[PDB]
């Protein structure tokens, strides 16, 4: 609802196409921070809603090291960037499980401690 | 120190390269472009014409913006024609 507020102003002025859009600030970014998730949505189900706008190559769900349950945020890289422009913009503020999730562009830095979780995820997304 | 700097640079590069979208990197332009699995049934229309991933459930999920961009897209494209045609004297 922070970002959703921008695009309405932006569009209203007829900004139209990325050169003048704030989405142009990125261009080298693909991963999207996916916030305010419900707790029971897992990687496969976050890999349901987000293929509407593109083809995901990677995904990471943030979850506590001990109990292994959702922190409530994920990082999902689309194959073709412009999906990011599309997902952030179009799907932000949308309800799943009662709570309206947040998306925004992100620069994502991998962490050693999950290293195996990368191949374990990749191998499934490497199937396609 | 120099070696350290070099290492840092390398890591930065790695970070950036990992982050970059795949189609741009091969790029040079603009059933998958990179052979990734693609959907089957007809999808909703889109600004960029991108096709949903094979794994899509098939429900509309949208705030409703993507359709409102077309309304503005059509508008702006229409008033370029209306401006001359409604001109009079």
């Amino acid at each position: 609802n922070k970002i959703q507020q921008i695009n309405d102003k932006e569009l209203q002025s007829g900004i139209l196409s990325p050169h003048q859009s704030w989405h142009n600030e990125y261009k080298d970014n693909a991963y999207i921070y996916i916030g305010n998730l419900n707790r029971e949505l897992t990687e496969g189900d976050i890999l349901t809603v987000f293929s509407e706008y593109g083809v995901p190559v990677d995904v990471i769900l943030s979850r506590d090291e001990n109990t292994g349950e959702s922190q409530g945020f994920a990082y999902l890289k689309y194959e073709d960037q412009r999906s990011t422009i599309l997902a952030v913009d179009n799907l932000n503020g949308f309800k799943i499980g009662g709570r309206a999730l947040k998306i925004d562009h992100t620069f994502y830095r991998p962490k050693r401690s999950l290293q195996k979780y990368y191949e374990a995820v990749k191998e499934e997304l490497d199937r396609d | 120190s120099k070696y350290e700097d070099e290492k840092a640079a390398e890591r930065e590069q790695y970070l950036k390269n990992l982050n970059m979208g795949d189609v741009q990197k091969l790029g040079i332009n603009v059933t998958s472009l990179l052979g990734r699995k693609l959907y089957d049934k007809p999808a909703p229309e889109n600004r960029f014409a991108i096709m949903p991933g094979s794994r899509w459930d098939g429900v509309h999920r949208s705030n409703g913006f993507e359709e409102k961009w077309f309304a503005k897209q059509n508008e702006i494209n229409e008033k370029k024609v209306q401006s001359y045609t409604l001109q009079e004297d």
Partner: peptide, 22 residues
């Protein structure tokens, strides 16, 4: 050698996504 990592992904449907449609 016991487990790769204690965490690991799922790739399993939750009842929430299917439920909302029906």
């Amino acid at each position: 050698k016991s487990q790769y990592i204690d965490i690991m992904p799922d790739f399993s449907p939750s009842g929430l996504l299917e439920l909302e449609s029906n």
